[PDB]
Structure 1
């Protein structure tokens, strides 16, 4: 038996993939404490009986700008609740750079994950070519091309689920040493139920100015002002650096991964 969480952007073809996997074997209700719909369904692999949980559409698990989205909170809450044994991240190939911000957050949290590259046919109309193994090597998790024809992308996805394992601990984003040391101090006073790696993540998001992470912080929210001011002795703007270090990482990956599909040559 298994429980998998389906996660991705609003326009990533996530809902369509859910229906194709589960089919008629579905159940409907709502998330705890709200009227927002919660779909669940089941399908079988060679070994496992999978229980697919459809999460709401989301671009990011965090937010700044004082803008709240209940769909994002519900998504982030389920991820941190550790209910699912595995996650399937639906990624749009025609908007890779934008979609990878969510993908990165799932990998930083240490959640076992399988990326499903969707809308490859639309990417080819944009003159875009995706390097699959180059992407997989940098993310440290398997990347399955979700081929529509004959539902053979679903078969490859089921094959990946039976082989699933802990993600390869690669170097994703390269933050500054003071930010990591300060985020670790916030992790000490955070509640001990949450894993160490996830506590360090939460504390890093608090420094950038996240509002969702403060719900799981506890007494660490009181130490934030002292910790944030302490970082400004070394760095000019901590919040700016975290955004740049994150952008730099994704920009580096997209340079290698996203290539031009076809072009008429002008030289020999």
Structure 2
């Protein structure tokens, strides 16, 4: 697919790669943010030229907020290759998930508001949304259940077909200019019949409680209620320690935070561990959703 060069600090690197790849980009080269950002192109002129003359790179992505000055200078150099900062990247990601008119419009509106200053200076299918943070590994889970990219994909489980919805992952510290765009795009998860809350188990005890609590809090804000939630404690193969300690916590805490909670199972999307068990739980959930209003 389309390749991209990524400029990002070591702290946001992991998240950046996840977001970029979520935008259907293959990260070929990675660089850290400039100590003293170039006043001209934000990045070294010699590096911009290298990327400019590298046919193996189609898009330049910088995980920071660029000034209108930088966009104009960089774009008038790339010729055809696109350039994206954090804000444009996120808006581009939202558009991929956006299904409703309001989301699509909020995204486009915010996009035009961000480009303006730059141009002025020149039979019965249930829906199962997969929610969670960017670091939860929810994307890997979607790709495993699907077999993989589409944000909506139907999968056969026995005699039932389930519509898996890869919703926009929760994002911490979002630019104020795109808050409304993200809120509406994320709120689209309220229209799902059920949800799969992916939880990063690698977190420490307190941080894990914070991620779980925050996840349900966010789901509460977007207007989710009455929807059966199947919690999946992801990243168990990376635990390298005690699983029951965190699993019990998640299970015992989830029931206190939200209702109804369908189930709470441990998984490992990459190693495809317990995924067979997961499919079984999905089927049982889909079976339940159909009988919910039957007589």
**TM-score bucket (shorter structure):** 0.3 to 0.5
TM-score by length of 1: 0.47
TM-score (norm 2): 0.43
Q: Highest Rg: 1 or 2?
A: 2
